[PDB]
Nucleic acid binder design. Sequence first.
RNA 1: UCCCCACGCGUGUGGGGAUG
Length: 215
Amino acid sequence: GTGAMWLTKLVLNPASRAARRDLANPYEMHRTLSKAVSRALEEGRERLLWRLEPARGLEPPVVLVQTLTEPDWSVLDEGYAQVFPPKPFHPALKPGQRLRFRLRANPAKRLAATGKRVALKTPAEKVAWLERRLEEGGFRLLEGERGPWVQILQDTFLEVRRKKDGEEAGKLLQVQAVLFEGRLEVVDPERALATLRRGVGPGKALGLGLLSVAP
RNA sequence: UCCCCACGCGUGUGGGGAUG
């Protein structure tokens, strides 16, 4: 019960306009990153996930990219990013294992009244959403004295211009992006692996949903 | 929360959102 996927670390170059474009617009980032696994996506063998990492200093922006298939970063423009070699990742997941995690996700609900997806409003609801999704996904958010072992380090409403070739009007993608960090435990290694590989919650094409775990 | 899909228990649930 090991599992496999590929992780790539990209260190983006603020001097590059293409990098700045993608850092500011998760949908454009989606378009850039997709090229690295273009044929796998078309063959229906791929689920690309990524996260723009929180910066804690003046360091350059770091983007973590997970793919099910081996990525080809030769597609990146010269100067766009420094690319660390994609590396096969075999997550160690066994029942009861405690792990630190980071997840930028879209805690949302589809309103009965409007049929539309909207953001859950309060921190309590965002945390409950995470607890629910983690448990359904074979993990479990740790609960220590002082509450759930999670912190919400960022909570922002994204309004992102979206445009595909052949489309006359460019739509506006609007999604709430919540950055969670904390501690969880593995419950069911197989379901937990599927959750790492498939991602958690909406907006996966927009740099949300990548559950990253580590001892 | 702008669009699309799946659905028989949820604040409706889940999935999708390149070919510049």
